[PDB]
Design a protein around this ligand. Structure first.
Ligand SMILES: CC(=O)SCCNC(=O)CCNC(=O)[C@H](O)C(C)(C)COP(=O)(O)OP(=O)(O)OC[C@H]1O[C@@H](n2cnc3c(N)ncnc32)[C@H](O)[C@@H]1OP(=O)(O)O
Length: 326
């Protein structure tokens, strides 16, 4: 744009945070279908990072005003730096600001000893509404490439178009019972939840990370859980969650539904999503629009989401780039 100033984005800097919040609100008017940014969520996203991860947040100023933002997430101990945000004011695009942000990105990755920069790019579905080809044309132009892994299929359910609960919730299969819980997971279900990511000399462990819950709460996010228990063995046969921001009463996020491998074949995923949705709507009556995302190779949950009225809208494509030389 001319002289660009890079200044860190710190949450105590009300003037700079305010501008960043505004940049986002304005870019979201013309970006991908999305819930508007919730300021509580966003500002807490500067203070409360996900587990074992550092943040390195920046804005870029032109003539003293923010005209873009770059956010990196650095997983502790990993050779990667993830671009959680690279955004240029809709009024100042095609002027080299994104390029400059990306160059600053590679420099920050390098300062943090990261070899690789990774990114999620919004693209079109073969089926779906044609999407802005800018991001992908930008990412190619910065020298990134698409990773050879399953992209995400990002889906929407609009309850004003289709009511999945019009025929109530299906019966719980014999041998099972439904349990529900709010934002914090009872101790009882924490380890069982973590073992649902499913010899003997090993080295790595899975565990429930309370910091996820605390990050959420700090971001003003509320959550809703339904679990299925297998009575004879007490294993947690399945579970699922919705996440809801302070802002945007009409929007909600459906998270993963996972069914334990020894409990497939009983329609737990359908029962779980419908019971959990009902549980959301009776606490969040104004919820109308629900989003979710599956890896495009997860056919089973895709088949479940579709039966429920979820419609694939856009594609979440993983890209990667070299950080170096210098
Ligand atoms: C890996 C990633 O960060 S993907 C980027 C994700 N960011 C977003 O989707 C946020 C919303 N969108 C944006 O903020 C802008 O659309 C983004 C990121 C390009 C920002 O970029 P800008 O400041 O406009 O672009 P900048 O001027 O540095 O980039 C230009 C290069 O990328 C390409 N490019 C950028 N935008 C487009 C576009 N909309 N259509 C086609 N090509 C494009 C061109 O090669 C362009 O170079 P130029 O025409 O000389 O040839």
């Amino acid at each position: 744009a001319g002289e660009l100033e890079f200044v860190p984005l710190a949450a105590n800097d009300d003037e700079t945070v305010g501008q960043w919040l505004d940049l986002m609100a304005l870019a979201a008017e013309t970006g991908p279908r999305a819930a508007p940014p919730c300021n509580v969520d966003m500002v807490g996203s500067l203070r409360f990072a996900p587990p074992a991860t550092a943040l390195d947040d920046w804005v870029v100023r032109s003539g003293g005003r923010v005209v873009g933002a770059l956010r990196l997430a650095l997983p502790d101990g990993a050779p990667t730096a993830r671009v959680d945000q690279l955004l240029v004011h809709p009024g100042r695009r095609r002027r080299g600001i994104g390029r400059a942000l990306w160059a600053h990105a590679r420099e920050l990755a390098r300062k943090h000893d990261r070899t690789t920069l990774t990114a999620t790019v919004v693209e079109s579905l073969p089926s779906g509404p044609a999407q802005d080809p800018g991001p992908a044309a930008f990412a190619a132009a910065m020298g990134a490439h698409r990773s050879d892994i399953p992209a995400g299929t990002h889906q929407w359910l609009d309850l004003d178009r289709h009511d999945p609960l019009a025929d109530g919730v299906p019966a719980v299969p014999a041998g099972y019972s439904l349990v529900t819980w709010g934002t914090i997971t009872p101790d009882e279900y924490a380890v069982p939840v973590s073992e649902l990511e499913l010899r003997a000399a090993q080295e790595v462990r899975t565990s429930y990370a309370r910091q996820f819950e605390t990050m959420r709460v700090g971001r003003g996010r509320r959550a809703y859980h339904t679990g299925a228990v297998h009575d004879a063995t007490g294993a947690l046969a399945g579970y699922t969650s919705v996440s809801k921001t302070t802002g945007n009463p009409a929007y909600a996020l459906q998270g993963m539904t996972v069914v334990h491998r020894e409990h497939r074949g009983h329609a737990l995923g359908t029962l779980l999503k419908l019971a959990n949705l009902e549980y959301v709507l009776r606490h969040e009556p104004e919820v109308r629009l629900v989003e979710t995302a599956n890896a495009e190779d997860n056919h089973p949950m895709i088949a479940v989401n579709a039966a429920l009225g979820f419609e694939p809208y856009d594609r979440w494509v993983f890209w990667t780039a070299e950080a170096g030389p210098s």
